[PDB]
Amino acid sequence: LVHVASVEKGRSYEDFQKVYNAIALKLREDDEYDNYIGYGPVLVRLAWHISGTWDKHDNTGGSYGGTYRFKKEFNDPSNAGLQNGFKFLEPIHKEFPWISSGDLFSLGGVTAVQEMQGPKIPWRCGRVDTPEDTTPDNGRLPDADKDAGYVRTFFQRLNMNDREVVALMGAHALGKTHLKNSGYEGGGANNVFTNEFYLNLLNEDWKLEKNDANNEQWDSKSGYMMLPTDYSLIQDPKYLSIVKEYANDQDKFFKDFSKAFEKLLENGITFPKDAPSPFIFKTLEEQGL
Ligand code: HEM
Ligand SMILES: Cc1c[nH]c(-c2ccccc2)n1
């Protein structure tokens, strides 16, 4: 099963920079969402959940086909809450209906990371909408109640190694959990992309507790929280070394996250040899907008 990137007809960098800018301006405008977190974090999670259905063994799932737009995937319990991100992107799509759904969902994540002061994430176009019968079944996204061995095995299906896993998980500095979405609560919140996930893991005083949905989570005195799968990154000695590395080197974290996030968003896609190079979008700040 081969998915060949096909550039939206006649489009180039500046067309996509316009879509980026529209997303970024809306991120700035709709600032009240989720008690003033804004839509950045939910857009990052959306880009990850549309990509994280991929299976390296048969090239099913992944961002290419834009299949989150279909009911089976939209209503995956694992995707509870992401409808907010989809609704945010709807007017963007209406303004730029030439862009494929997969390209828009993935571009939303890249824009959110960058606008939240994260690393630049090179991005490639050419995902093509595929039909409803190509939508992956529910159940391909990871459970949060598990341990390091589960996390390591899970991410092998996405062709991610220990460094890539630990880097990607740094996105859990962003946003918050919501009991009605996932059965986890708390931690306060954040909309600036930093390496704080790793600092919090190493420096806070953590206590395992059972929340009001009867799920276990790690809570700190200062009010932060970690999922069991987050905490597993300091329980496993291989993951712990990498946590320490990123806690001590912001730039290294940014570089590794950028590579892993681009990889995640591109898994399953064959780029022709004459395809355009990856685009690196300017932030609104860099453009004076
Ligand atoms: C073992 C892997 C992972 C597990 C079990 C997991 C689980 C979760 C859970 C349970 C939530 C809370 C959802 C809610 O209640 O609204 C969440 C939020 C979030 N996740 Fe993960 N996740 C994983 C990996 C990732 C990755 C790889 C990324 C992206 C690089 C990511 C990005 C986010 C973001 C940004 C949020 C906050 C969303 C918001 O504020 O609305 N997650 N995750
Ligand atoms: C699983 C997840 C996503 N976001 C967070 C979080 C962010 C800031 C503080 C505490 C938790 N956890």
Instruction: List the domains of the chain with CATH numbers.
Output: 1-141+261-289 (1.10.520.10), 142-260 (1.10.420.10)
Binding residues for heme b: 45, 48, 172, 176, 178, 181-182
Residues 6+ apart with CB under 8 A from 29: none
Nearest CA to ligand 2 atom 2: 172
Give yes or no for a contact between 107 and 244, defined as CB atoms under 8 angstroms apart.
Answer: no
Cα 230 to Cα 218: distance, rounded to the nearest angstrom: 9
Give the alpha-carbon dihedral of 279, 281, 82, 77, to 10 degrees: 30
Place of tokens 């899970």: 154
- The structure was resolved to a resolution in Å of 1.3
Residues 6+ apart with CB under 8 A from 269: 3, 4, 5, 62, 63, 64, 124, 126, 127
Helices 250-266 and 237-247, packing angle to 10 deg: 120
Cα 165 to Cα 162: distance, rounded to the nearest angstrom: 5
Cα 13 to Cα 19: distance, rounded to the nearest angstrom: 10
Residues 6+ apart with CB under 8 A from 268: 3, 54, 59, 61, 62, 63, 64
User: Cα of 185 to ligand 2 centre, how many Å?
Assistant: 9
Residue type present at position 266 = E
From the CB of residue 154, how many other CB atoms can be counted at a distance below 10 Å?
A: 18
Residues 6+ apart with CB under 8 A from 211: 179, 183, 184, 185, 186, 217
Measured between alpha carbons, how far is residue 127 from residues 120, 123, 268 in Å? 20, 11, 10
Structural biology method used? X-ray
Residue type present at position 228 = P
Residues 6+ apart with CB under 8 A from 228: 144, 145, 146, 147, 216, 217, 218
**Cα 270 from chain centre:** 21
Token pair listed for 23: 């997303």
* Ligand 1 and 148: CB distance under 6 A: no
Strands (E), 104-244: 206-210, 216-220, 225-226
